[PDB]
């Protein structure tokens, strides 16, 4: 979760609404196993 610790303060004549971009990755202890076939893509028929 991402919470406001204090507040978002801005001087006068400056935009009062901003954006945080979020990001993700792994570290050197991250591993995987048991390779399977992914479900993200489907095909209805042969691709001409």
């Amino acid at each position: 979760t991402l919470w406001y610790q204090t507040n978002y303060v801005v001087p006068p004549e400056t935009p009062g609404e901003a954006y945080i971009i979020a990001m993700g990755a792994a570290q050197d202890n991250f591993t995987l196993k048991i390779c399977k076939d992914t479900d993200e893509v489907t095909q209805q028929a042969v691709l001409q």
């Binding site: 979760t1 991402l2 919470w3 406001y4 610790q5 204090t6 507040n7 978002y8 303060v9 801005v10 001087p11 400056t14 935009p15 009062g16 609404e17 901003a18 954006y19 945080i20 971009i21 979020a22 990001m23 993700g24 990755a25 792994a26 570290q27 050197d28 202890n29 991250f30 591993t31 995987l32 196993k33 048991i34 390779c35 399977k36 076939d37 992914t38 479900d39 993200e40």
Partner: protein
């Protein structure tokens, strides 16, 4: 390698606004900006990451993950945020 992670989904934001999450001056203190579950293989934010797509070719995963937040606001804006990770056993916290 870090990859763009989508948090804002909803029915709105159209194409590229899904990548951004808003921060703005809050009247009531101690307010929740955003949340999401950190399972990379689960449908959700991590599908947009390239770590989340590569862990869908694999059944199991083990290791530490890192999440990076970059603030695109103006130079003259200030603030402090609290980002917290809660191990399982309950739904998301109600208050910080």
């Amino acid at each position: 390698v870090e990859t763009i992670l989508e948090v804002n989904n909803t029915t709105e934001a159209t194409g590229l606004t899904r990548l951004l999450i808003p921060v703005s001056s809050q009247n009531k203190a101690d307010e929740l900006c955003a949340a999401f579950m950190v399972d990379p293989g689960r449908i959700g934010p991590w599908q947009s990451t390239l770590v989340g797509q590569i862990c869908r070719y694999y059944t199991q995963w083990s290791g530490s993950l890192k999440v990076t937040f970059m603030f695109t606001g103006s130079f003259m804006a200030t603030g402090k945020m609290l980002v917290a990770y809660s191990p399982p056993g309950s739904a998301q916290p109600a208050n910080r």
